[PDB]
Structures are given as C-alpha cells and as structure tokens.
Amino acid sequence: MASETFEFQAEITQLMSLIINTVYSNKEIFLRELISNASDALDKIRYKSLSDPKQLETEPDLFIRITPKPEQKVLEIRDSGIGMTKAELINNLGTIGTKAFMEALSAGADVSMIGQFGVGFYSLFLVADRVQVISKSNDDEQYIWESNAGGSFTVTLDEVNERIGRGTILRLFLKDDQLEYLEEKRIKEVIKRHSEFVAYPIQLVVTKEVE
Amino acid sequence: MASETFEFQAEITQLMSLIINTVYSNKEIFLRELISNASDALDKIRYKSLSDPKQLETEPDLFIRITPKPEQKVLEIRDSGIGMTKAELINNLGTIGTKAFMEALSAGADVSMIGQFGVGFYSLFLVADRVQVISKSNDDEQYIWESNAGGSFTVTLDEVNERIGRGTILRLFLKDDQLEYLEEKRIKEVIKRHSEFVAYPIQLVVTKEVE
Ligand SMILES: CCO[C@@H](O)[C@H]1CCC/C=C/CCNC(=O)c2c(O)cc(O)c(Cl)c2CC1=O
Numbered sequence A, B: 001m002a003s004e005t006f007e008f009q010a011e012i013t014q015l016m017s018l019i020i021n022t023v024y025s026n027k028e029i030f031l032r033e034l035i036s037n038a039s040d041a042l043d044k045i046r047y048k049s050l051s052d053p054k055q056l057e058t059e060p061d062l063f064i065r066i067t068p069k070p071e072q073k074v075l076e077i078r079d080s081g082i083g084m085t086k087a088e089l090i091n092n093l094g095t096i097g098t099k100a101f102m103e104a105l106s107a108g109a110d111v112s113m114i115g116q117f118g119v120g121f122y123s124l125f126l127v128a129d130r131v132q133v134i135s136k137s138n139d140d141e142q143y144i145w146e147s148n149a150g151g152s153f154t155v156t157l158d159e160v161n162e163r164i165g166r167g168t169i170l171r172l173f174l175k176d177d178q179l180e181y182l183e184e185k186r187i188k189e190v191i192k193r194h195s196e197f198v199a200y201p202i203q204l205v206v207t208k209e210v211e
C-alpha cells in the first residue's frame, strides 16, 4: 500500500519548525487546541446531521476520547466528528491565517493565541516530534496523514489501523521529555483547566494491571 | 481483500452448537480458559525466545490485556504471545480431545472441565454468539479467523484492525444477556476468582468520562 508524498506550503513548514524547537514553557496548551478541533468536527457532523440524519449511522455516538499508549510513547485524541477525505487532509493540513500568527508571535504573543489564528493543530509539535492524523469521512476511505515537521508529509490509504466508523484520530508521538502526557492525573488536570465548556463527553482510556 | 471459507471438522461444529445453546449457569468460566490460553501462548514465545532472543523484538512486552468495548457489545482479550500463522489458525481452530469432552459432558461433567480436554477455546460461545480471532505470528502476516458457531469459518488477511506487533486478540461479540462482562467490576471479580496464579500482567482497559 504505497504512500504519496506532498510538499508543505512554505509558511506552514515555517510555523512547524519554530514550534518543534521552541523553549516555550506552557506546552500543555496543545490539548485544549486538539479538543477544540475535535469539538468543532463534532459540531459539523451534528449540524450536518440536522438535514441529513443518516450521516450519523457510521458512528452514532458523539464523543472525544483520549488514549495514552505508554509503551509506544504515543498519545491519541479521537473524535467521531465529520472527519476528512483524502483531499481534505492534503488541503487542510499541508497545501493551503498562518503567517499572521508567526508575526504576532515575534512581537511577544503567547502561543496560546494560536487557536485564534486558526492554526492550533500545529501546537501538537510542542509535545510531539511526529504525528499521524487518521481520518474517516463518510465520503471517503480511511486515510493516514503523517508529518515529522519537515517540508513534506505523506498520505496513505489505511490498511494498518483500527477502523474508526467516522471521525479523526490524532496520534501524537511524544518527545522523551514530554511523557507526562501519558499520565491519567496530568491529562485530567489539563482537561479541567482549559476545556471546561465542551458539549461532548471526553472519555479517558486508562490501562490498569489488576491484582 | 477476499475472505476464504473453510469447513469445520464435524465434531467441532458439534461442540460449538451445544455450547451456544446451553442453559448452563456458570458462563463466567470462559474467561479463565481464554486467559489460560493467553498465558500458554506467552509461555511459548518466552520459551522460544530462550534460544531465539530476536523473536521478542516484534513486541518486547509480555502481557494479557482485556478491553471492554461497550458500544459494540464486544469484549477483547489480547496477549503478546507467540501468535498463529494463517495455516495455524485454520488447523488449530477448525480443521483438526474434542469428542471425549462431549462424552464426559453427556455423563454429567461440568463444562468447567473443558480446558482439561484441550478445547476451552470453544467455551467463549457461552457468552458470545460470534468471535474474531486476530493473530500475528512473527512468521506470517496478520490474519482474522471468524466464526459464528456454524459449520464454516472464514480467514481473511487483516487490513482493517490495529496492528498487533505479535500475539492474538480474541474479539468476542457478546450476547445481549451477557453484557455484564463489559463491566470493570464483574471482570475483576472473575479474574481474581479463577486466575490467581498467572505469570504475566493482566491489564484491564477502562474508559471513563472525565468531569
Ligand atoms: C489548519 C488545519 O486545519 C485544521 O486544523 C482542521 C481542518 C479544517 C477545519 C474543520 C474540518 C472538519 C473536520 N475536522 C477534523 O477532522 C479534525 C478533528 O476531528 C480533530 C483534530 O485535532 C483536527 Cl486537527 C481536525 C482537522 C482540523 O481541525
């Protein structure tokens, strides 16, 4: 199953590089941004479903789910939102707001503003050096978009991950110094602090050895 | 990705049908049998690794993991044991002990003996009307064996489920009256009662909405 490679729009590559290298202290803001995106996508499939009810049948439950995978130093944020087609992943995430945030930043702006420029997605590079966005739109097959903050990303038809009925998974490969975001306590503390007013259930998946 | 269909050896079909239909009370024994199988497979990759250390690299952690999936009425039991090749799944599970258990049964035997006849796998039909066995041996690709207790099963190259590095997942589609096995409390109670002496960590995956 062959990967396709695409070039990032120049300013996006610009944004990603300063973030992956930054010494900024409050890296935990990435989670609010990703939950905010998840909530948005859930709004869209819900609003969409107002006039097209069958759009919900691929995954009737509306949720945001966070799943620590300690062994792989991975953190996943899933939602059963509207999802993105292959062409949406390519367009939305790489090939097409941005520059103005970098300008605000260089003047003293707090990266927490990132979401107000519409580019909070990229805040994930505060805690991760690599990401896979796995997405299933009702309108397309399941696809994997992958980036390590370089100048190019890949998109691959998904034959390796669990089927999500509909929606998007952000699979973050955490940096070695950022492994705290795998911890149930840390995660819950960050959720409560910055994501108080979310319309959808936020589920936390915890793995505990029984005794 | 095309399915292949195989016929069950007659006595196996025999065994499965009486179990899926039985009014037997103590259906919870299925879990000890599946944990026992998981432990066995883990023994085999560990013993195997004694003379062939690199066999462990596909999945360095040795664990048994149970994952309730309430939305799908599914219960998964995973291990990172030795796993089964496509030919092993076909051979082991369908096409090749058994009859003597059915004879013990018809004389008054308790189905809890099933494991002593080497066929405890089939006890899963006490709680499930359908199963998918997903397996990855170091020696083959990932495959899905599926049965609903009929006279035939299917085997399909796996392009739809998460990659397991190595091992086996039993995905049980629980009957409507058996949904109690999705419950953290129930599961823990059954583990402690019948699986006290297990050499490997038994991990329980619990999904909890945060507030
Ligand atoms: C600037 C890049 O574009 C994005 O940020 C957008 C894409 C366009 C805007 C909204 C589209 C609807 C579907 N959204 C998603 O699938 C999505 C999600 O369900 C969680 C996320 O964490 C991100 Cl990232 C995205 C994708 C996402 O939020």
Ligand SMILES: CCO[C@@H](O)[C@H]1CCC/C=C/CCNC(=O)c2c(O)cc(O)c(Cl)c2CC1=O
Binding pocket: B033, B034, B035, B037, B038, B040, B041, B042, B044, B079, B081, B082, B083, B084, B092, B093, B118, B119, B120, B121, B135, B167, B168, B170
């Ligand atoms: C009678 C049918 O044969 C089986 O029962 C056997 C297959 C032959 C014996 C042992 C083989 C080593 C690998 N075992 C597995 O992958 C396995 C597992 O890791 C969990 C299970 O729950 C079952 Cl079921 C099996 C498969 C299993 O235990």
